[PDB]
Amino acid sequence: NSVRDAYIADSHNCVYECARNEYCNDLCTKNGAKSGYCQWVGKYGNGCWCIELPDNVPIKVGGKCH
């Protein structure tokens, strides 16, 4: 699998919080995903969720935002 649906993360393992679905669709797609939307509830609470994000871009994994 070179793509996955998940919360996109920065290089510090932190999700990107969101107020708008479009903010997330833009963020996800400019990083190669198919689309994205804002999750206001989810495994890690508020943050952008991307569909088919390539695996050279980070996703939130277990651990802290550091």
Swiss-Prot record:
It is found in: Secreted. Residues 4-66 form the LCN-type CS-alpha/beta domain. Expressed by the venom gland. Changing D5A: 1.3-fold decrease in toxicity to mice, 16.8-fold decrease in activity on Nav1.5/SCN5A, and 7.5-fold decrease in activity on insect sodium channels. It comes from the Eukaryota. Keywords: Cardiotoxin, Disulfide bond, Ion channel impairing toxin, Neurotoxin, Secreted, Signal, Toxin, Voltage-gated sodium channel impairing toxin. Changing W40G: More than 50-fold decrease in toxicity to mice. Belongs to the long (4 C-C) scorpion toxin superfamily. Sodium channel inhibitor family. Alpha subfamily. This is Alpha-like toxin BmK M1. It comes from Olivierus martensii. The lineage of its organism: Eukaryota, Metazoa, Ecdysozoa, Arthropoda, Chelicerata.
